[PDB]
Amino acid sequence: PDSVDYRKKGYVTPVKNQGQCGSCWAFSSVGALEGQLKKKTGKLLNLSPQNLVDCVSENDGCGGGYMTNAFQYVQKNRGIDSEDAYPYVGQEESCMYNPTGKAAKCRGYREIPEGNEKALKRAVARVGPVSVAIDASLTSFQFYSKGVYYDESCNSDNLNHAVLAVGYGIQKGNKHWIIKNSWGENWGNKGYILMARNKNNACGIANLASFPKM
Ligand SMILES: *C(=O)[C@H](CCCC)NC(=O)[C@H](CC(C)C)NC(=O)OCc1ccc(Br)cc1
């Protein structure tokens, strides 16, 4: 497909805010799951980022983590709670079990061929929102406000932030990836940022992408 924007089909929930917690990966993971859930059931709702922060032991909660492990967890645990049944508190707590909390399930996940933007594009068009990792350490990124973001000093080999690709397209001749962050709706462009697509895998956008099976 030439251009995709899952927000137009109602596959994306509102922009969240990590608070005082480095739980970007939990947010990235739920966003993908929320997508497969909308596609599968027709229901659009917030999943529990906290459920993952607290239970994905392979990870390190507020200290950071990886999306794959989160997907592996939801599959092994036979489910993930919703935001309502397992609200976000912004810090790591003991893993809670909500008898009525299950709101989605995961039967695995797939990875995108490392550094392949073309494969990332095909995956977004056919699957839905995809979880991707990038280098967000540049002041240029942290202070992004508008336009298609590109900074040559971005480090493809310095993955330190997890986000969500809800689509892709082109703006003013510049191809981009539609990216949902989790620093609240006041960061970037209403919690969003258009990142350079096909610019030598800028910021390593396609170096660690994955989506959940549902
Ligand atoms: C995003 O908010 C966080 C910021 C963590 C620094 C405060 N970044 C991550 O969680 C990254 C996710 C991308 C690299 C995909 N993961 C990460 O930092 O891994 C660190 C880590 C430490 C210990 C364990 Br156990 C697992 C992972």
Sequence-distant (6+) residues with CB within 8 A of 75 are 105, 106, 107, 108, 109
What is residue 82's DSSP assignment? B
Rounded CA separation 118/109 (Å): 19
Superfamily for domain range 1-214: Cysteine proteinases (3.90.70.10)
Rounded CA separation 210/214 (Å): 13
Q: Whose CA is nearest to atom 14 of ligand 1?
A: 160
Rounded CA separation 9/137 (Å): 31
Rounded CA separation 65/162 (Å): 9
Q: How many CA atoms lie within 13 A of 146 on its CB side?
A: 1
- Residue 33, SS3? helix
Rounded CA separation 137/173 (Å): 26
Spell out the domain ranges in the chain.
Answer: 1-214
Q: Which of 51, 59, 181, 207 is catalytic?
A: 181
What is residue 124's DSSP assignment? H
Rounded CA separation 33/55 (Å): 16
Cα–Cα distances in angstroms (integers) from residue 57 to residues 60, 94, 101, in the given order:
7, 11, 19
- Per the listing, tokens 């933007």 go with 117
The alpha carbon dihedral of 186, 164, 166, 138 has a sign of positive
Q: Ligand 1 pocket: which of 29, 60, 132 to mutate (most atoms <8 Å of CB)?
A: 60
In angstroms, this model's resolution equals: 2.4
Burial of 170 (0-12, 13-18, 19+ CB in 10 A): middle
Rounded CA separation 53/38 (Å): 23
Rounded CA separation 139/65 (Å): 22
Paired sense of beta strands 148-149 and 192-196, if any: parallel
Sequence-distant (6+) residues with CB within 8 A of 33 are 47, 71, 74, 80, 104, 106, 212, 214
